[PDB]
From a paper:
To compensate for this, archaea, prokaryotes and eukaryotes have photolyase proteins, which repair damaged DNA using the energy of visible light.
The room-temperature structure was solved to 2.27 Å resolution and was obtained by serial femtosecond crystallography (SFX) using an X-ray free-electron laser. Using only 975 µg of protein, we recorded 209 242 diffraction images with a total acquisition time of about 2 h. Indeed, the mean r.m.s.d. calculated on the main-chain residues is 0.35 Å, which indicates that the position of the main chains was unchanged. However, some of the positions of the side chains change at the higher temperature. The residues with high r.m.s.d. values for side chains are located either on surface regions or loop regions. The X-ray pulses at free-electron lasers are so short that diffraction is recorded before absorbed X-rays can do damage to the protein structure, and we therefore presume that our SFX structure is not subject to radiation damage. In our SFX structure the isoalloxazine atoms occupy the same plane, and butterfly bending along the N5–N10 plane was not observed. Despite their small size, our microcrystals diffracted beyond 2.27 Å, a resolution that is high enough to be able to observe conformational changes of side chains upon blue-light activation and is suitable for a time-resolved pump–probe serial crystallographic experiment.
Author numbering: 2 to 503
The structure:
Amino acid sequence: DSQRSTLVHWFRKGLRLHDNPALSHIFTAANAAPGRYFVRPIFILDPGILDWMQVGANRWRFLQQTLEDLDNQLRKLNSRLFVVRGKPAEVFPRIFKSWRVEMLTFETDIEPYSVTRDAAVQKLAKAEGVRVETHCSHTIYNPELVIAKNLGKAPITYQKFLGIVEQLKVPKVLGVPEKLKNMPTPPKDEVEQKDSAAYDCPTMKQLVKRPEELGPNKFPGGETEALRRMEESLKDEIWVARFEKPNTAPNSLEPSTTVLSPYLKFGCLSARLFNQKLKEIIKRQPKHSQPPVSLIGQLMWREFYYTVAAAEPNFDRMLGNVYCMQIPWQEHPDHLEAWTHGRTGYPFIDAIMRQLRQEGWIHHLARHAVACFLTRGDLWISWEEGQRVFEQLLLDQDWALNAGNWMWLSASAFFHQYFRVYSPVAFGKKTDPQGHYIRKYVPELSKYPAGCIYEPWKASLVDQRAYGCVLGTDYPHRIVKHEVVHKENIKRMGAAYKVNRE
Ligand SMILES: Cc1cc2nc3c(=O)[nH]c(=O)nc-3n(C[C@H](O)[C@H](O)[C@H](O)COP(=O)(O)OP(=O)(O)OC[C@H]3O[C@@H](n4cnc5c(N)ncnc54)[C@H](O)[C@@H]3O)c2cc1C
């Protein structure tokens, strides 16, 4: 009857209860002063973007599942999730007054949109007397401290980055907040009085406006599934200890790596928790792998890309990007849409592009293959176009990680040995000589013998008819001949590399 002010936590990333310092500070404070505070954990959902085509339906569904899981977990603590519809610029001045907000917390984000939006709300909060407290728990280290320790610039090599963060101190990992005590549900504000369900978690139908893009629900969203999935990947301590990234297959029928990337992108899983549990396993396993190929090395790859991205607001762009080589990519809408829909005539990369569309995840080396094909390998199209397609279809779509890896693959930054080119025919044969992966995702070739399913043009016309799929009618011809265009493109990279040094 005497709760006079509301404490608010604001989810954007960090969609978990565990290891969430911003959220547990609100819960601790509320329990330390029983009867003074109402608590409101909020997510702000702008309905204007549900139609944006850069967010595929698979990612929308992941988000719906994550928010439901989050609301369920918060109910066990005598709270709940409040999903507020609106744009933050209009929501915060209302609830600041209406809920009499005393404190606001959230996890920090380095993406340029977030940085400016957060600065706006900080300004408004200072004016309105609201104390703001932010925490850096999306990453293991704080990119500003690593850039500081490096005398003001981001390290541009992996090994150098490791040298700095070795000097850094590792944050302590928190558990879950404790059940709220002596706290009734908050009284209804002006909009809850008009509709008691106005802040309820949205249904699938409300979030997924194009249900026809949905594929099979292989990777459910949310913290509960995140933690369950981590535990099973660590149950086999020897597999964890001897993990070597380049030796995992891109084209096995079940994933050869952890597929924790979607959960780390949304914050359903704490990277700091994952890192600590991995440290404990390395400790008691005397022969283990080392960075960069080890599992801890993979998390360090995430950390590296986040800190260089923090220093450059054009990280997702060629021009204005201080890291990125200026390379004269060409435009070809026909080649681009063929790549985009997995109709290039190279069965291996077509199968990758179709797994991506249907399922929303593909293995790291599968990404290397289709990215190299689109850019410096064959089509000579800008990595920005590949970033665009990946952004639509990837569950783990991440601003820094997508752009950084595309600049790497296209030899625009961080990696410069452009003479190495992946072969669209040969690369996958090493790990799937029978072509099971191709048969699953390119089912029109599923009756081809293994001796030509990677290169169906080697089959005669009589054989093609026997296999049930003739090139040019049931499956396209190669849109380019790899063995000639890749030689040309190696020359153009040398030309562009001269112009940049000069
Ligand atoms: C063109 C291209 C685009 C990419 N875009 C993304 C993206 O949008 N989102 C994304 O999360 N990763 C991206 N990656 C990196 C990498 O391919 C994925 O992180 C990884 O395949 C996810 O599978 P996993 O969780 O099983 O990885 P694991 O091998 O199990 O590694 C564990 C975790 O380490 C991190 N990690 C692993 N490899 C990398 C890497 N190369 N760079 C950065 N972090 C890494 C991720 O958090 C990952 O979940 C991209 C790579 C390429 C070549």
